Structures are given as C-alpha cells and as structure tokens.
Amino acid sequence: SMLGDVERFFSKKALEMRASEVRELLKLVETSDIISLAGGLPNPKTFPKEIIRDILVEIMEKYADKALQYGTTKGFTPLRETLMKWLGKRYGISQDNDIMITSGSQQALDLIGRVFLNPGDIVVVEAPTYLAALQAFNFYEPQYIQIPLDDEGMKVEILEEKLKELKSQGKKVKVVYTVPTFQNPAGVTMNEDRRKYLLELASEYDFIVVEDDPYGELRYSGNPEKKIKALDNEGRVIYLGTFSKILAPGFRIGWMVGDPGIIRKMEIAKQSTDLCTNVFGQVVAWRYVDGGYLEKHIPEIRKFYKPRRDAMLEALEEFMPEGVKWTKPEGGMFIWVTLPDGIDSKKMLERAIKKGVAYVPGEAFYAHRDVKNTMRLNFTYVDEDKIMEGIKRLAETIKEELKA
Amino acid sequence: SMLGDVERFFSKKALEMRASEVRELLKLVETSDIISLAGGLPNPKTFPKEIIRDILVEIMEKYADKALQYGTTKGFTPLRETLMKWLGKRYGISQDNDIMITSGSQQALDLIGRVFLNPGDIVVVEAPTYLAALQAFNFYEPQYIQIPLDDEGMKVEILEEKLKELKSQGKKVKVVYTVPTFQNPAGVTMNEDRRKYLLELASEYDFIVVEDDPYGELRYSGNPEKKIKALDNEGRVIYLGTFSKILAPGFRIGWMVGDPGIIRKMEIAKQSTDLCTNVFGQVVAWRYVDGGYLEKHIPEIRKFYKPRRDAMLEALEEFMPEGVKWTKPEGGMFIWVTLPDGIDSKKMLERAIKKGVAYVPGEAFYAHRDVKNTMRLNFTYVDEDKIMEGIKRLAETIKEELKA
Ligand SMILES: Cc1ncc(COP(=O)(O)O)c(CN)c1O
Ligand SMILES: Cc1ncc(COP(=O)(O)O)c(CN)c1O
Ligand SMILES: Nc1ccccc1C(=O)CC(=O)C(=O)O
Ligand SMILES: Nc1ccccc1C(=O)CC(=O)C(=O)O
Ligand SMILES: O=C(O)c1cc(O)c2ccccc2n1
Ligand SMILES: N[C@@H](CCC(=O)O)C(=O)O
Ligand SMILES: O=C(O)CCC(=O)C(=O)O
Ligand SMILES: O=C(O)CCC(=O)C(=O)O
Ligand SMILES: O=C(O)/C=C/CC(=O)O
Ligand SMILES: O=C(O)/C=C/CC(=O)O
C-alpha cells in the first residue's frame, strides 16, 4: 500500500478478514491443465442462450424503460408476482408470505445476518454447510452449533439434544440455517420426517429456519421433496431461491420469501446496501418465468447433468480403494467424499495437484473446522471424460497417501 | 406479522431501522398527478437504447458465456482495464491505483462503512450531504461532524477549525466523505483551491477522503474540474464512480478506485455480501466504454438536461418571492433552495402537495437533522413544461406560507 500501515484505518471486522490460502491455490489451479473437481460453477452448456437472446429483444422492444431505470428496493413487481405464483403451484408455498428480490442468495445471507444477529447470538448450521454462508454470517459474530449430516441430511435428533443442553444453560438458538436438498457441499437431502421434526423444534424452542434451496430443480433421480417452507404453518421459515443454477448466475438475481414483518425489515436493511437489485436482470428473469421458459428448460438442465453425476459415481465405485466413502446425491452439483485412516485432505491436496487433480478440502465447510478427512467434488463443469480420469487420479493419490 | 412480536428476533441495528414518513409520502406522490420535483432519477430519454440493443446483440454473439457465468469478486477484468484507461485519459487519475467493480456506488458506501468504521469513529460529511450515504454509514454507528457548503462547495476552512478542535480533545477524523461536483443535493461544486486544501488537511491530520462522483460528466456550463483523486499524490482518496447517470441505473454497475491495500480489503468484504456484481451488466458496461459509445453519448446527455436546468433557473428567478435563494448548478440533477423567515420546509410540504407540487424537504440530508428551511428540487425527470408550472406552484406555496 502507498499509505504504509493501511491497517491503521481498518475496522475491527476488517482486520479479522483474510484471504484463504486454499481458495487462492484453487484459483491458480483452475487456470492450469489440472483436472479440477474443486469448482462450484454450473456448466455454460446449460445456459438457455437462445431463450435469453429472444428475451433481450423483447425487453428492448417493450420494457426498455422499466429494465433500465432504478427499481424499488423490494424488487420488480411482475417478477415478485410471477415467483409467488410459481412457488405456489410448484411447491405449495403459501401466498400469505411476502417476497423480496435479492442480488443473489448470497445477499440474502448477508441480510439475514444483518437483521437477526447480534454478537454472540447462536446459529445452528449443518456440519458440513455452505462455506459462503459461514462467511456471510461471520461478519456479525455469531456462535455456531454444528449438527452432523448423515445420508438423510441433518441429524435433527442431535439438534434436539443440543437444544435441550443449551436450554439447561439458559441459552437458546436464534436461527437454524439449512441447505436441505442436494446440499452444497454434501449432496444429501433432509428427509420428510426430519423436515417436519425440525419445524416442531422451531415451534418448541422458538427459532427461525432459513431454508437455502439453489438446487431443488436439478433433480436427476427420485421424487421431489416437500420444501420445508411448504410445511411452514407458523411463518418461521425464510426460503431462499436463486436463478443462478436454473437460468445463469451472471444476472445475480435471487429471492427471499417469508413472514411480511421479516421481509419488511429486510427491505429496509437492503436499501442502504445496494439501492435495488439490478432491474435489467429482474426483467429478464420475469420474462423467463412468466413466459414459461423456466418450466421448459429445467428438464434440459436435468438431462445434461444426470450423466455427469452418474459418470462420477461409476468412476468412484470402480477406482476408489476400500475405506473411502461418498455420498450419492439425487441431484445438484456435488459429491462428498470421506477418507479412511485419518487422512487430512487439506495436506493431501498437495499430492493431488502433483498427480493432476484438485478438489476442495472439506475443513472450511465446518463452522469449527474440526473435520479434516472430507472433500467436495463437483461433476457439473469439468469435461465429461475428464470426470473418469480425474476420479482415477484422485483414487491413485489416496492409495499413495495411505501407504508408509 | 404471523410470529406476533417478530421484533424479538431482530438485531440491535435492525430494531433501530425505520421507514421514513416523508420518503413514504413522496412514493405516493410520484404515482399521482402532482408535479413532483422530489425525484432523484435520471430521464429515460437519456438512456442510449439503440447502443444498448447493439451491445446486447454483440454479447450474445461473442461474449455469452463470460456475461452469463459467475464473475470474480473484484470485477470483470476488461471493464476494470477499460475504466482505468478512461479515468487516466479523461481525468488524469494515476494508474498506480487499483479498481474494484461495485453493485452501484451505493454498495461502495456500505463497503466503506464495513471496512473503515468502528462504532464511534468520526466521519466528516458536508451539510447537506447525500442522504443514502448517511443511511449506509449509519449501520456502522459513526459520529458525524458536519461541514457547511457555500456556493463553492465544502467550507474547507471550517473543516480545519473543527479538525483543530477535535485534536484539542485528543480525537481524530477517520474519513471525510465528499460529493464535490454538482452535489446531490446542493448542486454546488468544490473549487480547485479547496480540493487541494482538503488534501493538505488529509495529510496533516491523517484521514482518508472518499470522493463520490456520479455527476461530473453531466456538465452544462463552465469548464471541467480536476477530480480530487487526480490531485492525490498520497493515495488517500477513494474515488467512486457509477454508470447510473451516464448509461442507465438498471444495470447497477459502479466502481471504486484507490490504494491497492484498501481495494484488497474491500474485495474480501464484498465477497460475502454478494459474491460478484452482476457480470452481464459488467460486460454491457465494458462494451459501452471500450466501444467508444460512452464518449459519444455524454454530449447528448448534456444537451438534453441543460435546457431543463435553465428552465428551472428561469422560473425560480421569475416566480420566487424575495428572500428565497437557490443554488446555480453547473451540472447534475438538482437545485437547492433556502427559504427565509424560518419556514420549516418539512411542515410546508403538506401545503405544497395541496397546491399540486412536491419536493424533498432538506432536513434528512443533514447528519444532525438541524437545518429546516431547505429543499431539493430535481429538473431531470419532469417534463419539461411542468418545470415552469411546478416552480410557480412552489412559489405561491411559499408566498402563502409566509402569511401568518
Ligand atoms: C447453498 C448455496 N447458497 C447460495 C448460493 C449462492 O448463490 P447466489 O448465486 O444466488 O448468490 C449457492 C450457489 N448456487 C449455494 O450453494
Ligand atoms: C452522490 C451520490 N452517490 C451515490 C449514488 C448512488 O448511485 P448508484 O446508482 O451507483 O448506486 C447517487 C445516486 N446517483 C448519488 O447521487
Ligand atoms: N467456483 C465457484 C463458482 C461460483 C460460486 C462459488 C464457487 C466456489 O465454490 C468458491 C468461490 O470461489 C466463490 O464462491 O467465490
Ligand atoms: N429514486 C431514487 C433512486 C436513487 C437515488 C435516490 C432516489 C430518490 O431520491 C427517490 C426518487 O428518485 C423517486 O422516488 O423518484
Ligand atoms: O424530513 C424527514 O423526516 C425525512 C425525509 C426524508 O426524505 C428521509 C429519507 C430517509 C430517511 C429519513 C428521512 N426523513
Ligand atoms: N479452504 C476454503 C477456503 C476458505 C477457508 O479456508 O476458509 C476453500 O477450500 O474454499
Ligand atoms: O433449485 C433449483 O434449481 C430450482 C429452483 C430453486 O429451487 C432455486 O433456484 O432457488
Ligand atoms: O463525470 C465525471 O467526472 C466522473 C463521474 C462519472 O461520470 C461517473 O461516476 O460515472
Ligand atoms: O456453487 C457455489 O458457488 C458454492 C460453492 C461453495 C463455496 O465454496 O462457497
Ligand atoms: O437519486 C438520486 O440520484 C439521489 C437521491 C438522494 C436521496 O434521497 O438519497
């Protein structure tokens, strides 16, 4: 810096902000010849570019001033209306909720942290959970309680145990954050019973549930789950959706649906952070839903990604040595791998890159960073032939790691 | 709310967020048939819609995957590079600075608050200043020091006097926030001597200057000022620009240029707030600048607004009674009016609306809400015949107000 010790101007929270060594390493990896399984990007082959071109034309013909002018903080009315009708019909979400458009779901997470969290307030997350949610919430200094996943998602029975223990200490949880369908990073889905059990606990212990659902339309097998929000009789759930993995991420348009008192406060918090979400992309998203193109395109996204999931699951079964385990997602973008014998997957990353493969070590996905033997793999966006070769390279790296 | 006392879940800062009575009133006014001079919107007649259509075509042909995929937090590299070349050539801003793309300048103000402000830190603003900057920074709980404007912008001598008084209390200012060209709301411009004086004080007292410049290209008379940033040999200035008033606000694209140590911290802070600014609008903006269209379009924006500033200045001179004073902007969107005899312009707004005219009362533009006799008028976004009729209605409202 030209200011010398620029840190002298920084706030306390800014002084705690750091670049991640692993993040920086993976950025460098993505530009080289290594087969990276570390990405969290959707595949541009799934972006509906012809439909988008037709919508851009339509916008310049018919809606140009609306798309180009400042918008309201809450969002473009027609997009709000179209999303609530979609959400109603498709998922059974109740029309008594209100809706706000956000600059991606990522912004929704930051607003959640702003509107609900005082320093020390307790937030329950899954272990693992979405890394950037931990990052959004950490600005507001919560305390976390981690609830392990199994193959049927959050172990809600362990959450009950922890709630009773917190109660015995005169403490309570304020928010439970869940990514309950095709989780980033674990790939697994909370079953129906657990969703209903979560909502009983939310009533009994008086907390808010944030359901973050980017991936529910990217279903490749099985039958559709009930959204937690569709079971929410009390108005305790805030449901987050996004166009990032159903349209394209580049428009940065997401939505937040919940109790109108909650949404009103979120609108005021958002006003100061950005004035509105970009209206141009909101009009694109409105045409995409209201014109029926979303409903038509979803099955093409699904046909695209399914064989990539399946190739990766075949390669793991064929190549991985005994002791290695992995999730079996019904949808989404990720498979999550657990190593035997106490291998530390972060230390192992060095070895993996030297054998021509990369993955995200799972440690940063745990709020307590306490689990060291996990990895997140992505199947959406390496070449579909590079999945087999990637998984083989990873398998051989694990074999080498396991010996003397 | 269906949760009853939903406030039980809200953070301390959320409990102190409130809707503004006047802002809500003015929203209702814009719907109706009142002549509103209260807007802060640019006129869609200045949006370069043909150029935008050609660029959208171009993007879908050549840049579709870049425009539709997630971007880096810092911004789209070609827009960053083209902006730095533009700012170098046009304004003489040094290439030693770094640049981050923001989701409007508004987001830049929130990030400045996050990165620099601990509760109690002292921020100097102009009196009046940009309302949404007060609102952005208020989340971070600064103390403000207010420096009056005169017709040549911030009275930097008064800022020296206050810096000396603070120093005698063992205290110092962290950030001076200035909107030094065609201010929103006052319309006036800090002269060159004061710019240089500000930067000497910045050195002597060790603070950072945030220069927020949405309007500098909307110049209708006079010669171009030197940007404070162009005079900044120490790297103490963070320069904020936006495409809102020179392309269209709907893309929500702005930029922040400053010391690389500062910009690195801003990038980390942003990452968790929104991942990236919408890439699709960043590509549009990149073509608009690099393609030479910004430079061609600026003179058409200026030709459009100039006669509207002039009509409003003519009407005020012809209609306003004695004692009323107003600023005489060389550019931008606003003219600022001062009422005599202790009229409270907030109380007078009711009277004005009954006579078919509206404006923004000036009180909320003061950090200390202590000046009661001012008003912000906008000339960009009506009609341009309703300007004369609006100002006449306003003049008669003031005459009646001045009577018992
Ligand atoms: C769990 C989760 N939450 C939210 C996000 C952030 O998404 P957005 O692009 O909407 O900001 C993602 C990525 N699709 C995610 O995996
Ligand atoms: C002084 C000032 N700063 C910031 C902004 C917000 O601009 P943006 O659309 O880039 O968020 C405005 C509105 N043009 C403004 O007048
Ligand atoms: N590779 C990605 C692409 C898009 C969103 C997240 C990811 C990630 O998994 C991490 C990342 O770099 C980020 O979030 O900014
Ligand atoms: N609308 C805005 C957009 C950006 C910044 C200020 C404002 C306003 O001041 C409000 C306004 O224009 C209006 O209600 O017409
Ligand atoms: O005079 C007012 O009471 C007033 C007027 C405004 O335009 C405001 C905008 C934002 C916040 C508070 C506000 N208060
Ligand atoms: N290890 C993280 C980087 C951030 C962190 O370590 O906290 C990742 O793989 O994305
Ligand atoms: O998850 C999907 O991909 C479908 C729609 C949705 O749930 C969302 O995008 O938020
Ligand atoms: O006009 C200027 O001088 C710079 C301000 C500007 O145009 C912008 O922010 O876009
Ligand atoms: O898909 C994504 O963008 C999320 C990836 C998980 C993370 O690294 O935050
Ligand atoms: O819209 C603008 O350009 C300025 C608005 C000022 C405000 O009311 O915050």
Give residue A364 CA to ligand 6 midpoint distance, Å. Answer: 5
Say if residue A184 carries a ligand binding annotation.
yes
Q: Tell me how close the Cα of B98 comes to any Cα of chain A, in angstroms.
A: 10
Cα angle value B310/B312/B318 (rounded, 5°): 100
Contact of A1 with B259, CB cutoff 8 Å: yes
Which of B213, B257, B330, when mutated, tests ligand 8's pocket best, judged by the most ligand atoms within 8 Å of its CB? B213
Residue of A nearest to B280 (CA): A250
Would you list which residues of B are annotated within the binding site for L-glutamate?
Answer: 369
Distance separating alpha carbons of residues A293 and B98, to the nearest angstrom:
41
The ligand with the least distance to the CA atom of B105 is: 2
- What secondary structure does DSSP assign to B99-158, as a single string? EEEESSHHHHHHHHHHHH--TT-EEEEEES--HHHHHHHHTT-PEEEEEEEETTEE-HHH
List C-alpha distances in Å: A56 to A285, B194, B225, B365.
Answer: 11, 46, 38, 38
Which of B131, B179, B181, when mutated, tests ligand 10's pocket best, judged by the most ligand atoms within 8 Å of its CB? B131
Interface test with A, best of B18, B47, B68, B205 (most A CBs within 10 A): B68
Distance separating alpha carbons of residues A278 and A253, to the nearest angstrom:
8
List C-alpha distances in Å: A220 to A216, A328, B244.
Answer: 10, 11, 42
Domain B69-293 bears CATH identifier 3.40.640.10: yes
Of the candidates A161, A282, A42, the residue with the CA atom closest to the CA atom of residue B280: A282
Which residues face B334 on adjacent strands? Answer: B378
Return left, alpha or beta for A342; rule: phi > 0 is left, psi -120 to 50 is alpha, else beta: left
Q: At how many Å resolution was this determined?
A: 1.6
The ligand with the least distance to the CA atom of B229 is: 8
Which are the contacts of B233, defined by CB distance < 8 A and separation ≥ 6?
Answer: none
Contact of A313 with A289, CB cutoff 8 Å: no
Proportion of chain A in helix, strand, coil states, percent, rounded to 5 = 50, 15, 35
Say if residue A140 carries a ligand binding annotation.
no
Architecture per CATH, domain B1-68+294-404, reads as: Alpha-Beta Complex (3.90)
Q: What is the dihedral of CA A248, A252, A258, A263, to 10 degrees?
A: -160
Distance separating alpha carbons of residues A211 and A227, to the nearest angstrom:
8
DSSP at B364: G
Within 8 A of B262 by CB-CB distance, chain A residues are 1, 3, 6, 9
Distance separating alpha carbons of residues B278 and B75, to the nearest angstrom:
9
Token pair belonging to B80: 């960053």
Residues with CB under 6 A from ligand 9: A 40, 130-132, 184
Return left, alpha or beta for B121; rule: phi > 0 is left, psi -120 to 50 is alpha, else beta: beta
Give residue B218 CA to ligand 8 midpoint distance, Å. Answer: 8
Domain ranges of chain A: 1-68+294-404, 69-293
Token pair belonging to B48: 């370069």
Give residue B378 CA to ligand 10 midpoint distance, Å. Answer: 10
Cα angle value A210/B13/B40 (rounded, 5°): 95
Cα B103–chain centre separation: 14
Is A116 close to B9, i.e. CB distance below 8 A? yes
Contact of B98 with B257, CB cutoff 8 Å: yes
Contact of B87 with B93, CB cutoff 8 Å: yes
Residue of A nearest to B75 (CA): A250
Token pair belonging to A195: 């969703």
DSSP at B256: E
Contact of A324 with A341, CB cutoff 8 Å: no
Helices and strands counted in chain B (H then E): 14, 14
Interface test with B, best of A21, A52, A58, A68 (most B CBs within 10 A): A68
CA atoms within 13 A on the CB side of A194: 21
